[PDB]
Enzyme design. Structure first.
Site, PDB file in Angstrom:
ATOM      1  N   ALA A 151     -43.630  47.243 -90.294  1.00  0.00           N
ATOM      2  CA  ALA A 151     -44.536  47.469 -89.153  1.00  0.00           C
ATOM      3  C   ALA A 151     -43.655  47.990 -88.021  1.00  0.00           C
ATOM      4  O   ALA A 151     -42.450  47.701 -88.002  1.00  0.00           O
ATOM      5  CB  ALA A 151     -45.226  46.180 -88.754  1.00  0.00           C
ATOM      6  N   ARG A 201     -50.206  42.567 -82.342  1.00  0.00           N
ATOM      7  CA  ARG A 201     -50.313  41.527 -83.366  1.00  0.00           C
ATOM      8  C   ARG A 201     -51.750  41.332 -83.828  1.00  0.00           C
ATOM      9  O   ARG A 201     -51.992  41.085 -85.013  1.00  0.00           O
ATOM     10  CB  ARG A 201     -49.644  40.208 -82.917  1.00  0.00           C
ATOM     11  CG  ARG A 201     -50.352  39.435 -81.840  1.00  0.00           C
ATOM     12  CD  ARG A 201     -49.405  38.386 -81.338  1.00  0.00           C
ATOM     13  NE  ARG A 201     -49.932  37.610 -80.228  1.00  0.00           N
ATOM     14  CZ  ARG A 201     -49.333  36.517 -79.733  1.00  0.00           C
ATOM     15  NH1 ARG A 201     -48.184  36.062 -80.256  1.00  0.00           N
ATOM     16  NH2 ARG A 201     -49.883  35.868 -78.711  1.00  0.00           N
ATOM     17  N   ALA A 223     -34.607  45.234 -86.526  1.00  0.00           N
ATOM     18  CA  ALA A 223     -33.971  46.554 -86.588  1.00  0.00           C
ATOM     19  C   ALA A 223     -34.455  47.363 -85.383  1.00  0.00           C
ATOM     20  O   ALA A 223     -35.543  47.083 -84.851  1.00  0.00           O
ATOM     21  CB  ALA A 223     -34.352  47.280 -87.917  1.00  0.00           C
ATOM     22  N   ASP A 282     -36.726  45.855-100.212  1.00  0.00           N
ATOM     23  CA  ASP A 282     -36.743  44.478 -99.731  1.00  0.00           C
ATOM     24  C   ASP A 282     -35.379  43.891 -99.899  1.00  0.00           C
ATOM     25  O   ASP A 282     -34.728  44.181-100.914  1.00  0.00           O
ATOM     26  CB  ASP A 282     -37.774  43.655-100.497  1.00  0.00           C
ATOM     27  CG  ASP A 282     -37.950  42.254 -99.932  1.00  0.00           C
ATOM     28  OD1 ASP A 282     -38.542  42.092 -98.844  1.00  0.00           O
ATOM     29  OD2 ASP A 282     -37.478  41.323-100.605  1.00  0.00           O
TER      30      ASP A 282
END
Length: 374
Positions: free
Chosen positions: A90, A103, A166, A258
């Site tokens: 996201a 959110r 990140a 992942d």
């Protein structure tokens, strides 16, 4: 009352304000099992169907939000089946000039995915092995399949995600934008915690598993955080099984991009998948991800049944399904292949997506007016 992706989004977007969205979807396809089968297993999934959903939200001719989600449907028989939502990525670019709840937007998109009938993915599945006949070019002289399945609508539903901070996930160089709010690892964990907690309260039965682990951390601080949750049954740990010796390789789910999967592959490269138990896995995961750029990662898992039977087959207003993998990638790459150090990237991404859809598919992005009061 809430049916279309338009209804869901509209409901969390601010009264009387204009937005547009892209909902993109790959063609469902046969894949490897989410978790490596072992030879002691009684079940090998007769089939695992993977589908990517990619979402982008636009305001005032600029992209500002994007979300990458995978839905796996695992089939054992006619009668039993499991669905798993893997929230991969996201992101935000900071190029939106009105206040919105990112959110509540992520939550409500997830609530849309949960309302989809898993049979929707099973109606036309690209096979993993495809038969083919080739004509050698000697035959021209100078004188010249999809699979389908069914399962029940009410099936075990799981949600897996891995939090790690990140600069960006989907918008290259958006951290160069001073309006972009970059979450630290703790903020990011709590932000996803809030979302899943609401998802539990609003969409899951009261007998649902809800799990959190913060890898390489002692479970004492995790238990502290969880006490502030409103869903009453959060536990420290994960939703994973403990087959074989508690070897990690037979229990860890293998998702695109992942960290869990990246370390499994690393272990494969050292011939150690027969030697690394689950407890060690988490320790050794921590040390490499941590020592690379020290930072809080969390792993969250949900597992249980929806309060409402999923029965939606997304319309053409709900999703756009390109004819090709190349067309899927091309559209997505207008968002992800762009530079976001300036607002111009957010404009070009809008411009390119809009033009591609109109010219190649005669389809507009969808527009919404928010309904939520202040």
């Amino acid at each position: 009352h809430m049916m279309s992706l338009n209804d869901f989004l509209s409901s969390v977007l601010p009264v009387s304000e204009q937005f547009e969205y892209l909902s993109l979807q790959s063609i469902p396809l046969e894949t490897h099992a989410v978790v490596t089968p072992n030879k002691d297993d009684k079940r090998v999934p007769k089939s695992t169907i993977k589908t990517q959903h990619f979402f982008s939200l636009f305001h005032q001719g600029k992209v500002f939000f994007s979300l990458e989600v995978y839905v796996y449907v695992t089939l054992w028989d006619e009668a039993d089946a499991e669905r798993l939502i893997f929230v991969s990525k996201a992101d935000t670019n900071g190029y939106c000039n009105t206040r919105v709840s990112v959110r509540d937007i992520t939550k409500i998109i997830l609530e849309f995915i949960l309302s989809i009938d898993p049979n929707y993915y099973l109606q036309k599945v690209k096979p993993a092995i495809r038969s083919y006949k080739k004509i050698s070019p000697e035959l021209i002289s100078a004188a010249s399949l999809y699979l389908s399945f069914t399962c029940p609508r009410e099936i075990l539903t799981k949600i897996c995600l891995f939090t790690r901070p990140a600069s960006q996930y989907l918008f290259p160089d958006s951290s160069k934008n001073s309006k972009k709010h970059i979450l630290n690892g703790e903020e990011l964990m709590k932000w996803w915690g809030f979302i899943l907690d609401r998802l539990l309260i609003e969409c899951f039965q009261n007998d649902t598993q809800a799990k959190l682990r913060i890898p390489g951390e002692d479970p004492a601080r995790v238990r502290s955080y969880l006490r502030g949750m409103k869903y009453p049954l959060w536990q420290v740990g994960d939703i994973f099984t403990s087959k074989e010796n508690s070897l990690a390789v037979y229990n860890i789910p293998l998702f695109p991009d992942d960290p869990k999967a990246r370390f499994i592959h690393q272990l494969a490269e050292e011939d150690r998948l027969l030697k690394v138990s689950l407890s060690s896995f988490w320790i050794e995961l921590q040390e490499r991800q941590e020592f690379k750029l020290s930072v809080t990662s969390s792993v969250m898992g949900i597992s249980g049944y929806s309060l409402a039977t999923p029965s939606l087959f997304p319309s053409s207003a709900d999703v756009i399904v390109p004819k090709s993998r190349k067309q899927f990638r091309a559209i997505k790459k207008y968002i992800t292949g762009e530079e976001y150090d300036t607002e111009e990237g957010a404009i070009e991404a809008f411009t390119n997506i809009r033009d591609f859809l109109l010219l190649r598919m005669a389809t507009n992005l969808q527009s919404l007016t928010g309904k939520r009061e202040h």
